[PDB]
Design an enzyme around this catalytic site. Structure first.
Site, short mmCIF file in Angstrom:
data_model
loop_
_atom_site.label_atom_id
_atom_site.label_comp_id
_atom_site.label_asym_id
_atom_site.label_seq_id
_atom_site.Cartn_x
_atom_site.Cartn_y
_atom_site.Cartn_z
N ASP A 290 -8.50 -11.13 3.08
CA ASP A 290 -8.85 -10.14 4.10
C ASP A 290 -8.90 -10.78 5.48
O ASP A 290 -8.40 -10.21 6.46
CB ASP A 290 -10.16 -9.49 3.72
CG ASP A 290 -9.97 -8.41 2.66
OD1 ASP A 290 -10.61 -8.52 1.60
OD2 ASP A 290 -9.13 -7.51 2.86
N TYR A 374 -12.23 -1.67 0.30
CA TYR A 374 -13.43 -2.52 0.34
C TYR A 374 -14.12 -2.54 1.70
O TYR A 374 -13.52 -2.43 2.78
CB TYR A 374 -13.11 -3.97 -0.08
CG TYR A 374 -13.34 -4.16 -1.56
CD1 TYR A 374 -12.38 -4.71 -2.42
CD2 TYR A 374 -14.54 -3.76 -2.11
CE1 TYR A 374 -12.65 -4.85 -3.80
CE2 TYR A 374 -14.85 -3.88 -3.47
CZ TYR A 374 -13.88 -4.45 -4.32
OH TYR A 374 -14.16 -4.59 -5.67
N1 LIG Z 1 -8.18 -5.56 1.54
C1 LIG Z 1 -6.74 -5.59 1.74
C2 LIG Z 1 -6.05 -4.85 0.59
C3 LIG Z 1 -5.89 -3.36 0.86
C4 LIG Z 1 -5.38 -2.91 2.07
C5 LIG Z 1 -5.22 -1.55 2.31
C6 LIG Z 1 -5.55 -0.62 1.32
C7 LIG Z 1 -6.07 -1.08 0.11
C8 LIG Z 1 -6.23 -2.43 -0.12
CU LIG Z 2 -15.57 -6.63 -6.47
#
Ligand SMILES: [NH3+]CCc1ccccc1
Ligand SMILES: [Cu+2]
Ligand SMILES: [NH3+]CCc1ccccc1
Ligand SMILES: [Cu+2]
Ligand code: NA
Ligand code: NA
Lengths: 620, 620
Positions: A290, A374
């Site tokens: 992230d 998240y």
């Molecule tokens: N956290 C990055 C992964 C992600 C990015 C956008 C939608 C769902 C999951």
């Molecule tokens: Cu988790």
């Protein structure tokens, strides 16, 4: 006039102008990262040069550039073309989030897969996931995102309740090509909704909670000067903000009598990674950084009074750049406040007759970020007694899949037909140490058990041993909860009144580190996550445990390449890198929206002071 | 009319009358312990019998007695003479605290030792320390305390700053004989004072702290009925108090819809021990069981509004018996209040557009106790999301010694000439489990790493394994932080809507357990402390991990003798015993009064609910 002041809208507007004039910000350009550079080591000669680092993407296929700019001098300092097959792709752009869905929505293979499942393409959301580096030779040097699909029954529906399993696509987002569509089989799309604001799901709301009012009738106890300089209860520090790392703490120091004593020069969460442990080819590539791939600071929430932050709140509103170089304010992006923290010290003495009670408090500096499903809160805490603590709060919606008929060893079931793959959330804290100055060393401290025998005839003795880490090649350390293992950062040239070196002790939570096989792609790209503690010699360009360009980098960059220099770290300018994380086997209670779970670390003084530093706290 | 109601002054006055009339409370008698007995298993036939257990000491050398009394029926149920050479001495009496000093003050060997050190006997305080069981055959069957001396320069002086090292005495407190005086050498008595209220030591008090006001303008959210029954945010429980254990929680249950679901039948801290790791013969015998030897509940503090407990506080004032059977109220001995606890759940969704934030809170039930130099707060926390947490807060003054010239491997230096021996603080939580009823089982859960290979071609998969503990002989478990080891208590006959057994997961802090040599006296007497987790089959008389009479017991009683019965624990009425503790290498900052340090454990629901249990929380 502090060099550690936040970036201003005016500075960012000048950067844009400088880039434009130099021919570096044409219509096919996008700024993927922009951030202020910290002052170089030994700027005490007073010579402010506000410099900015910029990553520039080209949507037409030309090579991206890394550019350093001085707003102070109004010039471009350097501009390098990047070979991304070599050094890594640039971070994901916010505007690429919806490109994956839109490109798939006209691909015949994609439409073929949706038609067989009777899914209307206008209802199918596609998560834009980072690609990593695996077996696909055609991907080297290309900007690839992978797409996993979720169904939205209506515009306000929670798509996470309706994963489309057995289907994944890969997309080149620069050439606008769908490179692969993989359909391994039809899975029923889980039917139950996960709408946690639907009265049919929540039931009648509670009427039993009544209010807690937290007020400070005389203000707060801390002061903020120069925009971002905090003074609170002998602590002094600067609160920075970076679009990649989020909140950064600079110049953490403690006023001990008349001396301002440094403790930490720079503290940040320098990387985080979420690896998934599901071996299905639909998800076995899935690991998102992230921080390094998506940049957590640019997704910081605006925090609401009374809901996100409660009490007497002072806000900071950091400014970042959008993809075209315009300044963008994150209104109320950082919350700061002090909090009562229970009893600090207490004793009723049977012989002197004195009863003594003092209360504790902590300074809280926090922000929240949201990247897809998240959500994370990052909290730094300063306590009256010299303790420094970091806490990460993980919440949001778990990433979902189908639950296979016949079960799974790597997925837990949350609702009929609905699964949640096992995964970890692993953080790297980068602590540029400055314990009473820059001459620091790290010792590993283990409990020592002693055997019954001479000198220990009743078999009660126990001890401890400390091992100095002298060179980088020996400073890659593992936790050992059994032996109470901690690490002490001390200054061998600064002694307390007992003539012992002043120090701080790092207390870890001792959670599991990276579980993936050591020969896997993720173990290579997230090598920092395989060990609990790393120590390096400070260097200007050694900023992130994973390197500068994490997206689609083949691995080995960052910490494993830094420590190969085998530099002296015994009484030198050093950086501690602490890995810590949560291993998440999702439970039913995590669905449809997850209650906060937490992980972190803390540092406590270890002979830094000559006695308790809180003897002068008043009696309330 | 609850059978779990607190003991009343009237009940204790009736116990005294019953004992007196039966001839059991003559002038040479002292009550060393008095407490209500929990209802027997299967009292659902409605037949209240309020029974009390009493330990009766005889100051003239006659044999002590264990007596059970029914205040309901006004009769003595049983009375047993105790052979203390066999089953252990009775707990230390408060009135024996000063007997050790007074007896030594006329002993010529003691006066000889003080004279050589030029100490005025009227200035010398003597700590009354439990004796344990070592090599001295003359002590078997005698009531022995050991004395370590400290100098008080004036009546309000902190004696702990002035230990008299190299000197220890043993005293028979019934025959009023000094059995041994051991003088191993003269040590300088440390001269610096440790008076933390002296303006010369504290300096000028801070004027920078300004007030935090926590108020509840509409009351509190919990209700208290029947004196000690709490209802709060779907939780239900009874708050008990016992003079040995302190606060005890009964009948912890959660209202899930229209069903009241039990979770824990009884929760207590059933023992604690502080073993010292200094091999000097002056202190190598030193291990005190604050719960089992001294009884922590009888030293509970009266807690002050705004200093000890802050906010909207509801107090309980438990009643105990003094040494003659008179009721004694502990005014404001238990504090209860709710606390804001930050963010509970939060998500901003990119596709649905919904922003969602909910705040957490916790119910706090706490008391503080002081036994000599040490002070502890015991905190039980109930959270909105089903989590239960215990936290112990250790503060007070560290136990001191001389710091030897030339240093020490088992003592740290706090001030010139002043040392603090290494030691541990180890707790035993006794959790009489009732997860959805009494048919429970314990599983050990480990993370499982998987190798790269077929079925795991990218080497990312990981899993977990659970091992059911089926018999007591296999239910003595060790922590393993490496493998993320936790324990799940489940009910195999009660399933959630996914058809999986409902459960709760215990999360330990994974701190070191007992460090002493396994052949030592303390390893035998505190055997519970050598392992992290024990599970037994419930039995009425199996109350304490160390047995009923800890003082001077030769060892082996309690848990190691219970589990030798090897009873079935797979879907039965079981008790979990969790050992957890702090290993304390004292630091300079712990002196002259120690900032709070903490340790504890928590239990979180694990498929107990059918979805998140906090969907019905309102938006503030
Ligand atoms: N956290 C990055 C992964 C992600 C990015 C956008 C939608 C769902 C999951
Ligand atoms: Cu988790
Ligand atoms: N905590 C029990 C040990 C103790 C008792 C009384 C004084 C000092 C120490
Ligand atoms: Cu201690
Ligand atoms: Na440094
Ligand atoms: Na039970």
């Amino acid at each position: 006039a502090s060099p550690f002041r936040l970036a201003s809208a005016g500075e960012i507007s000048e950067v844009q102008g400088i880039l434009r004039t130099a021919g570096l910000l044409g219509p096919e350009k996008r700024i993927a990262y922009l951030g202020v550079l910290d002052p170089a080591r030994g700027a005490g000669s007073e010579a402010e040069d506000r410099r900015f680092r910029v990553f520039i993407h080209d949507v037409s296929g030309a090579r991206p550039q890394e550019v350093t700019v001085s707003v102070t001098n109004g010039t471009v300092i350097s501009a390098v073309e990047l070979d991304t097959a070599a050094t890594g792709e640039l971070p994901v752009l916010e505007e690429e989030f919806e490109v994956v869905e839109q490109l798939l929505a006209t691909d015949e293979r994609w439409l073929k897969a949706l038609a067989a499942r009777n899914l209307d393409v206008s209802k199918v959301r596609v998560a834009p996931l980072s690609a990593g580096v695996f077996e696909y030779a055609e991907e080297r040097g290309r900007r690839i995102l992978r797409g996993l699909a979720f169904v939205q029954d209506f515009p306000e529906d929670s798509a996470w309740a309706h994963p489309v399993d057995g289907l994944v696509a890969y997309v080149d987002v620069v050439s606008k090509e769908v490179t692969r569509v993989i359909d391994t089989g039809v899975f029923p799309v889980p039917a139950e909704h996960g709408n946690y604001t639907d009265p049919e799901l929540t039931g009648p709301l509670r009427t039993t909670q009544k209010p807690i009012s937290i007020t400070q009738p005389e203000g707060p106890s801390f002061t903020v000067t120069g925009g971002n300089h905090i003074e609170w209860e002998k602590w002094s520090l600067d609160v920075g903000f970076d679009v990649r790392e989020g909140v950064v703490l600079h110049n953490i120091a403690f006023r001990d009598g008349d001396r301002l004593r440094p403790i930490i020069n720079r503290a940040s969460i320098a990387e985080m990674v979420v690896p998934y442990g599901d071996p299905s080819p639909i998800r076995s590539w899935q690991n998102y950084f992230d921080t390094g791939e998506y940049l957590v600071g640019q997704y910081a929430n605006s925090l609401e009074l009374g809901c996100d932050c409660l009490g007497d709140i002072t806000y900071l509103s950091p400014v970042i750049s959008d993809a075209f170089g315009n300044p963008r304010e994150i209104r109320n992006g950082i919350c700061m406040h002090e909090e009562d923290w229970g009893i600090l010290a207490k004793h009723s003495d049977l012989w002197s007759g004195i009863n003594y009670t003092r209360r504790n408090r902590r300074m809280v500096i926090s922000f929240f970020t949201t990247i897809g499903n998240y959500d994370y809160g990052f909290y730094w805490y300063l306590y009256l007694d010299g303790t420094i603590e970091f806490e990460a709060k993980a919440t949001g919606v778990v990433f979902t899949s189908a639950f296979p008929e016949g079960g799974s060893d790597n997925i837990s079931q949350l609702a009929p037909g609905l699964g949640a793959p096992f995964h970890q959330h692993i953080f790297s804290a980068r602590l540029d140490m400055a314990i009473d100055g820059f001459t620091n060393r790290v010792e590993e401290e283990d409990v020592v058990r002693q055997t019954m025998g001479p000198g220990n005839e009743r078999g009660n003795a126990f001890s401890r041993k400390r091992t100095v880490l002298t060179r980088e090649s020996e400073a890659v350390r593992e936790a050992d909860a059994r032996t109470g293992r901690t690490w002490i950062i001390s200054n061998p040239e600064s002694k307390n009144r007992l003539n012992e070196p002043v120090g701080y002790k790092l207390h870890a939570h001792n959670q599991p580190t990276l579980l993936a096989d050591p020969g896997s792609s993720i173990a290579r790209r997230a090598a920092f996550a395989t060990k609990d503690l790393w120590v390096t010699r400070y260097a200007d360009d050694e900023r992130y445990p994973t390197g500068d360009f994490v997206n689609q980098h083949s691995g080995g960059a960052g910490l494993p390449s830094y420590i190969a220099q085998d530099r002296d770290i015994d009484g030198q300018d050093i950086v501690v890198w602490h890995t810590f994380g949560l291993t998440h086997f999702p439970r039913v209670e995590d669905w449809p929206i997850m209650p906060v779970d937490t992980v972190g670390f803390k540092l406590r003084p270890e002979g830094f002071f000559d006695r308790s530093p809180v003897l002068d706290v008043p009696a309330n």
